[PDB]
Amino acid sequence: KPINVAIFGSTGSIGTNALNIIRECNKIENVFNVKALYVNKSVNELYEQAREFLPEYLCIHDKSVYEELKELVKNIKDYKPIILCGDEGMKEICSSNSIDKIVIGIDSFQGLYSTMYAIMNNKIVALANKESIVSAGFFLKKLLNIHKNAKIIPVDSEHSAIFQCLDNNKVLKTKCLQDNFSKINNINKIFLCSSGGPFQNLTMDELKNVTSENALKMGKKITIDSATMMNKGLEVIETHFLFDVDYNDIEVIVHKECIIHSCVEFIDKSVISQMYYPDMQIPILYSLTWPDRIKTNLKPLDLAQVSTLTFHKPSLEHFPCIKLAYQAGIKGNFYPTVLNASNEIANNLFLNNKIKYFDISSIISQVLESFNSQKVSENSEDLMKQILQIHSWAKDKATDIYNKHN
Amino acid sequence: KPINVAIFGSTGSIGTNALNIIRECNKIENVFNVKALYVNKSVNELYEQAREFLPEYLCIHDKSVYEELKELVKNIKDYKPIILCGDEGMKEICSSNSIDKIVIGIDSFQGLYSTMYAIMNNKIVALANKESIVSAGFFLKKLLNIHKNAKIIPVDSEHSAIFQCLDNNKVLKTKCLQDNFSKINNINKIFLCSSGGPFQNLTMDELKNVTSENALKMGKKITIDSATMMNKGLEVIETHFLFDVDYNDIEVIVHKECIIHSCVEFIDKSVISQMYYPDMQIPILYSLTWPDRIKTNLKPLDLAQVSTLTFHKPSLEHFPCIKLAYQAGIKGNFYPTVLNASNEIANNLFLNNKIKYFDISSIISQVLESFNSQKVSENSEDLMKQILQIHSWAKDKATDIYNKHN
Numbered sequence: 153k154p155i156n157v158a159i160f161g162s163t164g165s166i167g168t169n170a171l172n173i174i175r176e177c178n179k180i181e182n183v184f185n186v187k188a189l190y191v192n193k194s195v196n197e198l199y200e201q202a203r204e205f206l207p208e209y210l211c212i213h214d215k216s217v218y219e220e221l222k223e224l225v226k227n228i229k230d231y232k233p234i235i236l237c238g239d240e241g242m243k244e245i246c247s248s249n250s251i252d253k254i255v256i257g258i259d260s261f262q263g264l265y266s267t268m269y270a271i272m273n274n275k276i277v278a279l280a281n282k283e284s285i286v287s288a289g290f291f292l293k294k295l296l297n298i299h300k301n302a303k304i305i306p307v308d309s310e311h312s313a314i315f316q317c318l319d320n321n322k323v324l325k326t327k328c329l330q331d332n333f334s335k336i337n338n339i340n341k342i343f344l345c346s347s348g349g350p351f352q353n354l355t356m357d358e359l360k361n362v363t364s365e366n367a368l369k370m371g372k373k374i375t376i377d378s379a380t381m382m383n384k385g386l387e388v389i390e391t392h393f394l395f396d397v398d399y400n401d402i403e404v405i406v407h408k409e410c411i412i413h414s415c416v417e418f419i420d421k422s423v424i425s426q427m428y429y430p431d432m433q434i435p436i437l438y439s440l441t442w443p444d445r446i447k448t449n450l451k452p453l454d455l456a457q458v459s460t461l462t463f464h465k466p467s468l469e470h471f472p473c474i475k476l477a478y479q480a481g482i483k484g485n486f487y488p489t490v491l492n493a494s495n496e497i498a499n500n501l502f503l504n505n506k507i508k509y510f511d512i513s514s515i516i517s518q519v520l521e522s523f524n525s526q527k528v529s530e531n532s533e534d535l536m537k538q539i540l541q542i543h544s545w546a547k548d549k550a551t552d553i554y555n556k557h558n
Numbered sequence: 559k560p561i562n563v564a565i566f567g568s569t570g571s572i573g574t575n576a577l578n579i580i581r582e583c584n585k586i587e588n589v590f591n592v593k594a595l596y597v598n599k600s601v602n603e604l605y606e607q608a609r610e611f612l613p614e615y616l617c618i619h620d621k622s623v624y625e626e627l628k629e630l631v632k633n634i635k636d637y638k639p640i641i642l643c644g645d646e647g648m649k650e651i652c653s654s655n656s657i658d659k660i661v662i663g664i665d666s667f668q669g670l671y672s673t674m675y676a677i678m679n680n681k682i683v684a685l686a687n688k689e690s691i692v693s694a695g696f697f698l699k700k701l702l703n704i705h706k707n708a709k710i711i712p713v714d715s716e717h718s719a720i721f722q723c724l725d726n727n728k729v730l731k732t733k734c735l736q737d738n739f740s741k742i743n744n745i746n747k748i749f750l751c752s753s754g755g756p757f758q759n760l761t762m763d764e765l766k767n768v769t770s771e772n773a774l775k776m777g778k779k780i781t782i783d784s785a786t787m788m789n790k791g792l793e794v795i796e797t798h799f800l801f802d803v804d805y806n807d808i809e810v811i812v813h814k815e816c817i818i819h820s821c822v823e824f825i826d827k828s829v830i831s832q833m834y835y836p837d838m839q840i841p842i843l844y845s846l847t848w849p850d851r852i853k854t855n856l857k858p859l860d861l862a863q864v865s866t867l868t869f870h871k872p873s874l875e876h877f878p879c880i881k882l883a884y885q886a887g888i889k890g891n892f893y894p895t896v897l898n899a900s901n902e903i904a905n906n907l908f909l910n911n912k913i914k915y916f917d918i919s920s921i922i923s924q925v926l927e928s929f930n931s932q933k934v935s936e937n938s939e940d941l942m943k944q945i946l947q948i949h950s951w952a953k954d955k956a957t958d959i960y961n962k963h964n
């Protein structure tokens with residue numbers, strides 16, 4: 153049985169790493185059928201991928217470049233795809249009975265929409281977009297309880313590492329984002345590793361004046377998130393939701409070599425970790441082969457050559473985004489939504505030289521303080537409406553706080 | 559529901575660590591039932607253990623301290639144990655329907671005899687004794703093919719580590735020492751971690767001069783073997799047999815902080831590792847709970863405090879015992895039997911200040927070169943007698959070489 157996969161956001165970083173490892177793995181033996189590709193706007197790139205991979209379905213979000221895609225594709229001999237457009241095309245792909253697994257490599261809040269529909273169709277969802285879990289974790293949980301045969305399999309590297317450390321006999325008794333996942337897998341505690349980002353050695357005074365150029369010189373948004381360690385704060389909430397680990401049992405550790413990707417402490421106090429070169433091919437591949445593994449031709453890890461690994465605790469004073477993520481997660485309710493939203497705005501303000509480093513945490517903290525816990529709707533549709541309303545409110549609030557001071 | 563366990567070698571390092579962790583696990587709930595304790599002659603220590611754990615059976619190998627044991631144990635009120643001695647006693651305990659799991663913490667080739675009988679009675683054998691696997695790997699594989707419900711669960715720290723790094727969903731479909739274990743578990747290669755012992759950074763001139771005093775100041779035997787890295791050599795052969803990993807796929811790494819206990823590379827090139835403070839309580843406990851894990855109160859690993867982990871290749875010029883073990887393993891047949899036996903002798907000679915460090919590998923090498931391959935008996939009982947004959951031959955040959963140069 154080949155593995156029938158759709159790639160959503162095929163032309164981006166995650167998407168192109170997915171097709172890479174699929175390509176290489178297929179050269180060893182033909183295991184993967186790429187059944188569908190979906191992008192926003194990159195019509196020429198999508199064309200090139202369709203030419204190589206010959207998928208049954210092509211979809212582009214933006215209506216404006218639909219006709220252009222149809223024209224380009226006719227150049228391809230012996231190939232009659234179903235060529236689609238927009239949300240409707242995304243839903244048609246998700247409901248195909250010939251597709252088993254969907255890689256969600258669509259960034260930002262937009263990525264939740266396809267994630268939702270992939271679950272609704274009881275697919276395996278290889279989810280890279282941590283913001284969907286941070287903004288909508290409780291909703292995704294409820295949804296995964298309606299759609300019992302759907303599964304989220306984590307792609308974010310640290311989360312993939314945690315998942316790889318587990319015994320699948322116990323994993324198969326539950327699934328990601330389920331209450332009691334950690335209890336069933338006998339997990340006590342998580343070490344969430346971090347690169348620490350480019351500002352890891354700067355003083356408070358140096359940080360006061362750092363700029364986005366300093367942080368940038370991956371995509372801009374996750375790069376800024378890595379500089380402030382808000383990425384890791386988002387990943388702490390992601391860990392809580394994915395594995396049902398309490399916040400007091402998630403420890404961020406700075407591992408600048410980026411060889412140990414994260415570690416899992418069980419109840420006996422034994423720790424199991426996943427290691428490799430920094431790499432998104434293995435996380436992606438595992439999400440598509442779980443619960444099995446297949447041969448690759450990747451470079452073997454040469455531990456003697458690596459020689460030295462280092463670990464240290466991040467300073468919360470230098471990286472206050474971490475503290476804010478814990479605070480929001482511990483509060484629960486819609487605070488993680490608010491955190492994610494306000495960080496989207498502040499990240500962009502910093503990227504564009506409108507605010508300073510410590511203003512990022514300042515704005516986020518102020519939005520969080522202004523929010524009030526809301527009765528969580530038991531209706532799935534109403535709940536999604538609440539998440540959207542709170543998201544838009546928090547972004548607006550972030551922007552207001554910025555413009556007040558400015 | 560209690561797990562019924564026998565501790566063979568109850569008064570030694572492994573045996574005392576086993577009872578220490580069982581004690582802690584039995585504080586509130588009756589998790590384990592200590593059914594039997596077996597020792598060589600340490601009759602007063604056994605007495606004290608009998609008072610604590612009140613096993614159904616006590617057994618002493620040395621019949622000359624039997625009456626002293628019967629004397630000591632009558633002081634314990636409303637306790638009527640079955641007190642047995644020697645090989646007969648051992649076999650009656652292994653035969654009991656009241657015993658599920660046996661921890662083998664008997665040292666040297668002597669530990670093979672209870673290992674074999676434990677397998678012949680379809681028990682779970684929690685095996686610390688590596689010499690039995692090196693000396694009789696092929697024989698134990700054959701025995702485990704006959705005795706279908708018997709299992710060897712490793713307790714040696716690195717081998718427990720490897721075993722934990724595997725996915726139990728795959729492990730559960732095979733068992734250690736079974737052909738095709740590595741295929742079923744998708745294992746590509748093993749990183750077999752070592753402390754490197756006390757002599758790891760000596761120059762060749764310095765190493766010429768080392769004495770047993772230097773190496774000593776666990777059993778004394780294993781302690782000298784750690785110094786010469788013959789322990790690791792034996793462990794390579796143990797790896798090969800337990801996990802069906804080819805010798806070219808076992809890599810010794812020196813990791814002096816002893817936090818990472820060993821690592822498995824899978825066929826996708828993902829590596830999984832097991833880490834903890836140097837410790838034998840986790841390996842022993844896991845051998846008795848596998849495929850589950852239970853709660854301990856061990857000190858949690860503080861990776862930030864450890865701060866630094868290092869890795870390098872051992873020098874084979876400095877640690878020639880490693881090379882000899884690989885050579886012996888790869889030759890197969892009874893060469894591992896001869897390696898282990900000649901080492902028993904050479905280890906003891908160095909321990910007692912009779913030979914120099916490089917004479918250890920010299921003696922072992924000469925015995926290996928002297929040995930001629932033998933047709934492997936096809937029946938169990940003859941194959942065992944052949945192992946014993948060769949083992950005795952190689953010890954005598956070692957002593958003869960020593961006597962001649964001396």
Ligand SMILES: NC(=O)C1=CN([C@@H]2O[C@H](COP(=O)(O)OP(=O)(O)OC[C@H]3O[C@@H](n4cnc5c(N)ncnc54)[C@H](OP(=O)(O)O)[C@@H]3O)[C@@H](O)[C@H]2O)C=CC1
Pocket residue numbers: 160161162163164165166167190191192193194195213256257258259260262263280281282283307308309370371374432
């Ligand atoms: N990059 C990495 O290594 C890691 C990323 N992640 C997460 O992965 C997610 C994806 O990130 P990354 O690859 O970096 O992002 P990119 O910006 O590189 O790629 C996003 C992709 O989504 C497509 N897309 C955007 N909007 C739509 C839409 N409405 N419909 C369909 N396709 C759409 C884009 O199409 P187009 O080409 O037309 O613009 C593009 O192919 C993020 O949430 C990130 O946090 C997680 C861990 C590490």
Ligand SMILES: NC(=O)C1=CN([C@@H]2O[C@H](COP(=O)(O)OP(=O)(O)OC[C@H]3O[C@@H](n4cnc5c(N)ncnc54)[C@H](OP(=O)(O)O)[C@@H]3O)[C@@H](O)[C@H]2O)C=CC1
Pocket residue numbers: 566567568569570571572573596597598599600601619662663664665666668669686687688689713714715776777778780838
């Ligand atoms: N110590 C450790 O941490 C490690 C040990 N191992 C392996 O575990 C095994 C045991 O090692 P260790 O505990 O250090 O050894 P010890 O020397 O500390 O203990 C030996 C135990 O075996 C008993 N014994 C010896 N001969 C017999 C016999 N004929 N019948 C019954 N009991 C007998 C001894 O009894 P008595 O007290 O009566 O002499 C004692 O209880 C070895 O094969 C070693 O390589 C593996 C990894 C690490």
Ligand SMILES: O=C(CC[C@@H](c1ccccc1)P(=O)(O)O)N(O)CCCCc1ccccc1
Pocket residue numbers: 308309310345346347348349370374377378379381383384410430431432
């Ligand atoms: O979250 C992420 C990115 C952010 C984290 C990071 C950054 C660099 C390395 C490891 C971790 P952070 O700890 O700084 O927050 N992943 O999960 C990325 C992993 C590998 C990215 C990769 C890039 C280039 C080449 C191959 C791999």
Ligand SMILES: O=C(CC[C@@H](c1ccccc1)P(=O)(O)O)N(O)CCCCc1ccccc1
Pocket residue numbers: 714715716751752753754755776780783784785787789790816836837838
């Ligand atoms: O084979 C062994 C002993 C020899 C190996 C060793 C020695 C020290 C630590 C790690 C490894 P070696 O690599 O030098 O051959 N184990 O598996 C021991 C494991 C740890 C147990 C423990 C022992 C002493 C004190 C507290 C803990």
Ligand SMILES: [Ca+2]
Pocket residue numbers: 622623624625626
């Ligand atoms: Ca006597």
Ligand SMILES: [Ca+2]
Pocket residue numbers: 317318319721722723724725726
């Ligand atoms: Ca495992």
Ligand SMILES: [Ca+2]
Pocket residue numbers: 746804807
């Ligand atoms: Ca091989």
Ligand SMILES: [Mn+2]
Pocket residue numbers: 308309310387
């Ligand atoms: Mn990540």
Ligand SMILES: [Mn+2]
Pocket residue numbers: 714715716793
């Ligand atoms: Mn060992």
